[PDB]
Design a binder for this molecule. Structure first.
Ligand SMILES: CCCCCCCCCC(=O)O
Length: 133
């Protein structure tokens, strides 16, 4: 039951993204630009294959995956990670692993908004997306 996630979403609120980027080792100049960007996230499905696009004026990313199947991913900050996306309690949980480190990207629907929670180390960032029609 991934169907409620599908569509086009626009960032409307961000808390502590600088704290998350610093924890990942992102350089101050990239943090500047990223702090002022309002990405568009598009989530599409074709059968068992999900595609997640993140578009912005700064960086674009795209991944395609099947739920529960590991994949190789190159992140926006140029980390080469082993990724798995699963559905857990109605949340879309994206785990990235590299160099014995982990970060989670959890997406949940609350009151029709998409809440993305990013955790690395002690850093927790919350990003709120709203559906575009
Ligand atoms: C340039 C820093 C990149 C950090 C990793 C990707 C974070 C995604 C944020 C989002 O989709 O809203």
């Amino acid at each position: 039951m991934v169907d409620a996630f599908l569509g086009t979403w626009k960032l409307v609120d961000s808390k502590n993204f600088d704290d998350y980027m610093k924890s990942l080792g992102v350089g101050f100049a990239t943090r500047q630009v990223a702090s002022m960007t309002k990405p568009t996230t598009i989530i599409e499905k074709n059968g068992d294959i999900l595609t997640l696009k993140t578009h912005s004026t700064f960086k674009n990313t795209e991944i395609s995956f099947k739920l529960g199947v590991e994949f190789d991913e190159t992140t926006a900050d140029d980390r080469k990670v082993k990724s798995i996306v699963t559905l857990d309690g109605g949340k879309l949980v994206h785990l990235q692993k590299w160099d014995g480190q982990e970060t989670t990207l959890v997406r949940e629907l609350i009151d029709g908004k998409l809440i993305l929670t990013l955790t690395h180390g002690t850093a927790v960032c919350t990003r709120t997306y709203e559906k575009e029609a």
